[PDB]
């Protein structure tokens, strides 16, 4: 994985941004399979596992900054990308940032000028999950949720852990958390979703992109 321009790649990236714009505006979510390729994705996974084994993950928290394991059962680490052993995570974030930048001005009326650090997450089996929720119900600035999944050879019948999305349609969209899949969806009340109980270690990275005007309301 060259973490640092081919013509075919540059043209593909334009095509991907056009798909993302259309799919988010039309359906409220977009799936991109094989986003980084297996070599780069393996490096991301290896760095996430090394971080987890190093004992730096805390409990996932709710908007009141408290944890209730029966509501949200993941362990998380906030990663900016420049920490030791995180170059592949930084590479992922740069690829997502480039994708979002190519969509700027075409995603609703949002103006995206910032995002969270990477939220690296593990649901450590044991039937842990995240009950149905909305990422941004109260105008906290988050406009697009991006998930990157890291689970090789995952079988949801055995291991659960699907993301179930309920696009604001009368139907559930059941999404497997498969290795090297990117998922984007509007963060607000249009997209309730839940992480179904996981029966194996389930890894993912989240980036939340902010709408500048709404995000200002959170300044302190």
């Amino acid at each position: 994985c060259d973490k640092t321009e081919k013509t075919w790649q540059l043209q593909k990236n334009e095509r991907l941004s056009n798909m993302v714009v259309n799919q988010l505006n039309t359906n409220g979510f977009c799936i991109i399979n094989n986003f980084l390729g297996s070599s780069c994705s393996t490096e991301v996974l290896q760095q996430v596992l090394n971080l987890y084994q190093s004992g730096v993950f805390s409990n996932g928290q709710l908007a009141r900054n408290v944890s209730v394991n029966r509501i949200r059962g993941d362990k998380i680490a906030w990663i900016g990308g420049d920490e030791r052993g995180c170059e592949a995570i930084k590479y992922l974030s740069s690829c997502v940032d480039s994708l979002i930048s190519r969509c700027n001005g075409r995603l609703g009326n949002y103006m995206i000028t910032g995002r969270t650090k990477c939220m690296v997450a593990c649901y450590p089996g044991s039937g842990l999950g995240y009950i149905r929720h909305i990422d941004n119900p109260n105008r906290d600035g988050r406009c697009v949720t991006v998930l990157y999944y890291l689970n090789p050879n995952w079988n949801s019948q055995d291991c659960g852990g699907q993301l179930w999305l309920y696009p604001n349609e009368n139907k559930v969209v059941k999404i497997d958390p498969i290795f090297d899949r990117l998922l984007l969806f509007w963060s607000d009340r249009r997209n309730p979703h839940e992480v179904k109980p996981a029966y194996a270690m389930r890894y993912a990275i989240t980036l939340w992109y902010f709408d500048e005007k709404e995000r200002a309301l959170s300044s302190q």
Binding site: L62, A63, Y130, I134, N138
Partner: peptide, 18 residues
């Protein structure tokens, strides 16, 4: 209710400018 179930977001001093 959904208000209490949202995932925590670090406050703006931790935001990454694009």
């Amino acid at each position: 209710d959904y208000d209490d179930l949202a995932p925590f977001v670090p406050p703006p001093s931790f935001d990454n400018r694009l």
